[PDB]
Design an enzyme around this catalytic site. Structure first.
Site, PDB file in Angstrom:
ATOM      1  N   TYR A  55      -0.993   5.748   5.309  1.00  0.00           N
ATOM      2  CA  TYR A  55      -1.963   5.854   4.204  1.00  0.00           C
ATOM      3  C   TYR A  55      -3.022   6.864   4.630  1.00  0.00           C
ATOM      4  O   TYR A  55      -3.497   6.759   5.755  1.00  0.00           O
ATOM      5  CB  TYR A  55      -2.616   4.502   3.900  1.00  0.00           C
TER       6      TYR A  55
ATOM      7  N   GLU B 270      -5.821   9.924  -2.645  1.00  0.00           N
ATOM      8  CA  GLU B 270      -4.994   8.971  -1.890  1.00  0.00           C
ATOM      9  C   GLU B 270      -3.641   9.644  -1.679  1.00  0.00           C
ATOM     10  O   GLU B 270      -3.145  10.215  -2.656  1.00  0.00           O
ATOM     11  CB  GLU B 270      -4.917   7.754  -2.798  1.00  0.00           C
TER      12      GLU B 270
END
Ligand SMILES: CC(C)(COP(=O)(O)OP(=O)(O)OC[C@H]1O[C@@H](n2cnc3c(N)ncnc32)[C@H](O)[C@@H]1OP(=O)(O)O)[C@@H](O)C(=O)NCCC(=O)NCCS
Lengths: 326, 295
Positions: free
Chosen positions: A110, A198
């Protein structure tokens, strides 16, 4: 303002990030031609909507031929896709992306960044726990969320990206590639006035390549006046039609699920107006900011249907009471 | 009172514009000292019988101003803010809506070593009732008194002002810190000022969805504020992931919601109301003060 997957990938690729390359197809024939142009054995066809959870909703498909690509593009284009991040009516699919297969991926990482309101700094978050609900990781195992606060004078420095890379268990050339990825993301963030981004997952392939597979870019709509090329990416079909109609008259409309309408000057007073209705048994239909309750006070703005300044009302409480009683 | 009083000399950036003109006329009618203004290209002219300057350096040299209010459109605010921070002015009020978050990030970091306070952007400004108003708030609803008010909203602040005026408590100073993600002055900065102001005998803290500012403010109050604080949070009913007008008014990832702001007030011993109509009533209950306008 949200960007499509293909738009977010073109933008990040222009900043030197490695992305899961694809081709946007506006009809099934362009999709077939895309599968052939990539020249892979397998491609992934992804409905281009502004909402995650496309995979579980049936909007992400592995294909192994031009005809199969044409077929999937046929089943998706022109049908609203409903995901857990849309409402019951979902978002129109006017295109699909036909993307290279990044199989096999070793690891899902991530990487994201926001303007952190508490520290007043651009802040990156990274984790070994990619490809999942990052909120659930942050809740259950906060030690697995790495944060880097960026100093605005010096910006993100390689050492900050290296500290993260070593903590993510990255090795050899992966460290250098992650540094380039994070520095590019920072440059993009500032130069494009991101509100957030993101990369989920930031995949590590069998051969160690670091690839942006999915995620999100949201731009600061306050800054689009200075990014004409980004403002031109706007896809009005992904917006709520009633919200869009209202905004074109510089009115802020947000639809709720209730049966009382309300007209208010100021976002704070609009929420307080809704809340004092729901306090008096009412269910608000909407937030609106210039059965219906009209409620105007007036600062910069100079001064069945209940009116607090036709049923008239004397204070806030009066109006909430009167309008639910109707 | 804090920051502004009857001695405050105010410059207006965008003085010659529509809102600069309107609100300067209202400020002058209220007894606020509008010494002049800056609009690049209109230097050496007169507006509202006050001098206009091309630059804040000229304007401060001429007027000795110590406050400025910004009515310039969002694209020019960063430039206007750095200009006034550089000028010698001690207090800057930014009314403008639509300033990019990353422009305020830079302006806020620029302030760290400066003797300058910035209130806003996207805010109604600051008022010391009976002495000085800097911004767009209606003077006549206020009354000189003993309640300090801090709010992330405009019109919703006016409800708390009307309630405390109608109970006869009045206001010491009211600060609208604005609805943007990075304000020039935050809740804690404003709470410290009100804590140290003898005229302020109680504090109203008005918040809404977005950020953790109210939770942080609650943790500050628990250990650093001795005066009674009454909280109110707007936006119990807002859907998540939706900008509720204000750039800063959004629930992102189960955070920035209203019931957890109410829960942080409880943990800090801070009294609150769930009714926007009952801010004055809750303050009266907590303080046990007289409503002299009942009899
Ligand atoms: C800031 C705002 C009020 C300006 O709107 P406006 O008064 O209609 O705008 P105008 O164009 O008439 O006036 C702006 C002036 O700034 C001037 N200006 C531009 N750049 C400037 C600068 N760097 N320094 C000083 N003045 C500047 C312009 O020249 C113009 O004056 P002019 O018309 O004499 O040339 C508006 O953009 C806005 O933000 N409105 C919403 C405010 C709000 O609701 N805030 C929340 C309150 S709770």
């Amino acid at each position: 303002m949200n960007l499509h997957e293909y738009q977010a990938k073109d933008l990040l690729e222009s900043y030197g990030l490695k992305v899961q390359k694809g081709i946007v197809a506006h009809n099934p024939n362009e999709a077939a031609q895309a599968f052939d142009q990539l020249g892979g054995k397998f491609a992934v066809v992804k409905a281009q909507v502004h909402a995650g959870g496309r995979g579980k909703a049936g909007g992400v498909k592995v294909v192994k031929s031009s005809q199969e690509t044409r077929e999937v593009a046929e089943s998706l284009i022109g049908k609203n896709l409903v995901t857990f991040q849309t409402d019951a009516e979902g978002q129109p699919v006017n295109s699909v992306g036909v993307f290279e297969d990044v199989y096999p991926v070793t690891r899902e990482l991530y990487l994201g960044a926001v303007v952190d309101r508490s520290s007043r700094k651009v802040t990156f978050m990274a984790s070994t726990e990619g490809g999942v609900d990052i909120e659930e990781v942050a809740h259950n195992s906060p030690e697995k969320i790495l944060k880097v606060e960026v100093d605005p004078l010096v910006g993100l420095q390689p050492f900050q990206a290296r500290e993260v890379a070593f903590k993510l268990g990255l090795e050899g050339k992966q460290i250098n590639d992650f540094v380039k990825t994070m520095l590019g993301a920072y440059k993009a963030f500032i130069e494009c006035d991101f509100a957030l981004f993101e990369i989920n997952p930031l995949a590590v392939r069998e051969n160690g390549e670091i690839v942006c597979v999915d995620g999100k870019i949201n731009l600061d709509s306050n800054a689009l006046y200075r990014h004409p090329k980004l403002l031109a990416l706007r896809d009005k079909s992904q917006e709520n039609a009633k919200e869009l109609k209202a905004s074109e008259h510089e009115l802020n409309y947000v639809a709720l699920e209730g049966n009382i309408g309300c007209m208010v000057n100021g976002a704070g007073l609009a929420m307080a107006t809704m809340d004092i209705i729901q306090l008096y048994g009412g269910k608000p239909a909407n937030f609106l900011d210039v059965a219906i309750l009209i409620n105007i006070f007036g600062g910069i703005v100079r001064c069945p249907v209940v009116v607090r300044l036709l049923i008239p009302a004397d204070g806030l409480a009066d109006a909430a009471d009167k309008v639910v009683k109707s | 009172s804090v920051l502004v009083d009857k001695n405050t000399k105010v410059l207006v950036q965008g003085f010659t514009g529509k809102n600069g003109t309107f609100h300067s006329e209202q400020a002058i009618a209220y007894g606020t000292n509008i010494v002049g203004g800056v609009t690049p290209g209109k230097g050496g002219t007169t507006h509202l019988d006050r001098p206009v300057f091309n630059t804040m350096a000229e304007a401060v040299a001429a007027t000795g101003a110590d406050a400025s209010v910004i009515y310039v459109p969002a694209p020019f605010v960063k430039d206007s803010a750095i200009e006034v921070i550089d000028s010698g002015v001690k207090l800057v009020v930014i009314i403008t809506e639509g300033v990019p978050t990353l422009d305020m990030l830079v302006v806020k970091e620029y302030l760290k070593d400066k003797d300058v306070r910035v209130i806003g952007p996207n805010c109604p400004g600051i008022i010391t009732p009976g002495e000085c108003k800097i911004g767009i708030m209606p003077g006549h609803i206020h009354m000189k008194g003993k309640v300090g008010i801090i709010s992330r909203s405009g019109t919703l602040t006016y409800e708390a002002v009307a309630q405390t005026t109608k109970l006869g408590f009045g206001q010491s100073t009211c600060i609208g810190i604005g609805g943007d993600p990075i304000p020039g002055m935050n809740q804690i900065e404003a709470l410290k000022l009100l804590e140290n102001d003898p005229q302020t005998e109680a504090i109203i803290l008005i918040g809404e969805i977005g950020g953790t500012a109210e939770e942080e403010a609650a943790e500050y109050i628990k250990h650093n504020v001795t005066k009674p604080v009454i909280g109110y949070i707007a936006g119990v009913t807002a859907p998540p992931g939706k900008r509720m007008g204000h750039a800063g008014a959004i629930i992102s990832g189960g955070k920035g919601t209203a019931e957890e702001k109410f829960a942080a007030f409880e943990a800090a011993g801070i009294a609150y109301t769930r009714s926007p109509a009952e801010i004055g009533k809750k303050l009266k209950e907590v303080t046990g003060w007289e409503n002299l306008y009942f009899q």
